[PDB]
C-alpha cells in the first residue's frame, strides 16, 4: 500500500547536536538525526519506517547526552520506544509527540531510511512545513 512500509537498511551520517536538540524541532526544517544515533542504527534492517522510529527513540533512551534533557516521565516514554511528548504549545489536537519528517518527501523519491533525509519536528512545525 505504502513505500514507507517496505523493508530497508538505515544509512547516513546525521549531525552533532547539543542540549537544545529538541528545541530545534519546532523551527526551520526541524532538528537533524544526531550523529551518535546514526552510528548505532547504520546498516540495521527495518521492516517499516515505524520500526525505524521505535529504534530511534530506544537509542535516545540509552544515550546519556540525549536522555538527560528529558524529564523522568519523558524518559519512561522513550524507554518503551515511544516518541516523547512536546511542550503543550507545540501540540496540535491529538498530535502531542515529536514527529519524524522526511526532508525530501518519499512521494517525490526521498529516501525512507537515510538519516540525512530525516528530521525531528514538533506537530505544529511538521503541519506548517507540509502546508509550505
Amino acid at each position: 500500500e505504502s513505500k514507507r512500509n517496505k523493508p530497508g537498511k538505515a544509512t547516513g551520517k546525521g549531525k552533532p547536536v547539543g542540549d537544545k536538540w529538541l528545541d530545534d524541532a519546532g523551527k526551520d526544517s526541524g532538528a537533524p538525526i544526531p550523529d551518535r544515533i546514526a552510528d548505532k542504527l547504520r546498516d540495521k534492517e527495518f521492516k517499516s519506517f515505524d520500526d525505524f522510529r521505535k529504534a530511534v527513540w530506544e537509542e535516545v533512551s540509552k544515550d546519556p547526552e540525549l536522555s538527560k534533557n528529558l524529564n523522568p516521565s519523558n524518559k519512561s516514554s522513550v524507554s518503551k520506544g515511544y516518541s516523547p511528548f512536546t511542550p503543550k504549545n507545540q501540540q496540535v489536537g491529538g498530535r502531542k509527540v515529536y514527529e519524524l519528517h522526511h526532508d525530501k518527501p518519499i512521494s517525490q523519491g526521498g529516501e525512507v531510511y537515510d538519516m540525512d533525509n530525516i528530521r525531528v519536528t514538533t506537530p505544529k512545525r511538521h503541519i506548517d512545513i507540509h502546508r509550505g
Binding site: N71, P72, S73, N74, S76, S77, S79, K80, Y82, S83, P84, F85, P87, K88, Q91, G94, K96, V97
Partner: protein, 83 residues
Amino acid sequence: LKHSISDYTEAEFLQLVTTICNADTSSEEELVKLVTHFEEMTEHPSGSDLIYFPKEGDDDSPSGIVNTVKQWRAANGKSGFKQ
C-alpha cells in the same frame, strides 16, 4: 469513575498519574489517551506540561503532580476530589 476530577478519590487520581509517569501502557496510543484524559480532568492551563515540562523547581514525581493539581484546583474555584 472517569468523567471528572470529582469522580476520583485522591488515591485513584494518584494511580492514574503514576501510570502516565511510568508510561505503563501497551501502546503509544494508550499513553496519549491517558494524557488527554488528564488534561481534560484537571483543566489546568499548563496541560501535559505538568507531567513533562515542569516549571523550575516544581516536583514532577507522581505525588508532586497530584499536589500541584490539588492546590491549583482549590485556589481557582474548581471542584475537588471525591471523599
